[PDB]
Symmetry: C2
Subunit: 184 residues, 2 copies
């Protein structure tokens, strides 16, 4: 035995920032991951990468995205990034291999289908690294809004639209529902 | 006032069967929808359509899919179908617009990201008709397996791989978790 954090029971949390909502025509501009155990304890935070994209593309973003990504400082980190999809993927992969094996953990986060659709198109290896299933906190959010609005309203999230920050919020949100929405 | 079931609080449940897992390469061969209220009471079941596809496509399915879709009788229903994506979408659309307005309800069901990706590519209008978000029972399934295995194991689901029967399972599974996993 040893005290290393590896285990196939471990959960992988991942968030992305994109130039838009269309996985076929938009790109990934940021990636972050966090590994927790099944009890939601953070074991290690993964690398956070601004992913370089050609400026001609970044200037074809709508107002909402140019506003948010400039504001958060992400657009600047992107212009000065020497990391493309493959390198981010590889490094992320090397990190995740330490805590859990391939296809073991579901994709964990908030509204992660969109992420799954970008991963599938731009990061096939990392995408395949996840189990087919998803652990989406947003589902708990919906149920809290419909069935226990006072519970949902007690955990207001203010997203900074930065991957590492958002992943941290996703975990905290799940921890919250476990205590206040779940029968355990 | 009136006793018609329409409401923007109503939920739309939808299941699909495909020829495979690749949305850019595979096709929808079945669709079904069910509308419930927020309390999960079933208001009305929607049209269940076997969707016609050419034999050259169906015969290119792997063993697993040819086995399941033949056995479930879906394959014969597909060959004999006079309905394509557009007609199924239109009729489904005409049905849904009587219980909820556009973009109000999340996509509801089990592991619906796969469905969202086929809907997006093959049924643009119906896809736009849902709210961006998802209500996935699979998420509850995961948490129960990790945090309360005895609860998860008390509702074993045997899927027939027929859209309408799967939708009815997804609802009853949510009803099951609401009672035995939720703090209500
Ligand atoms: Mg975000
Ligand atoms: Mg199925
Ligand atoms: Mn996100
Ligand atoms: Mn984010
Ligand atoms: Mn299904
Ligand atoms: Mn199904």
């Amino acid at each position: 035995s040893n005290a290393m954090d590896f285990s196939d029971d471990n959960l992988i949390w991942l968030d992305l920032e994109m130039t838009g909502l269309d996985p076929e025509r938009d790109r990934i501009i940021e990636i972050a991951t966090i590994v927790t155990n099944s009890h939601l304890d953070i074991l290690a935070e993964g690398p956070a990468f601004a992913i370089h994209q050609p400026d001609k593309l970044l200037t074809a973003m709508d107002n909402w995205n140019t506003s948010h990504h400039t504001a958060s400082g992400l657009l600047e980190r992107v212009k000065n990034s020497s990391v493309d999809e493959v390198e981010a993927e590889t490094l992320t992969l090397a990190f995740l291999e330490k805590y859990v094996s391939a296809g073991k953990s579901p994709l964990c986060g908030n509204s992660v289908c969109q992420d799954r659709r970008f991963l599938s198109r731009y990061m096939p290896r990392l995408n395949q690294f996840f189990h087919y299933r998803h652990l989406d906190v947003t589902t708990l959010k919906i149920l809290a809004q419909r069935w226990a609005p006072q519970i949902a309203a007690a955990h207001i999230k203010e997203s900074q639209h930065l991957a590492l920050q958002d992943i941290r919020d996703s975990i905290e949100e799940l921890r919250y529902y476990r205590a206040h929405l779940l029968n355990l």
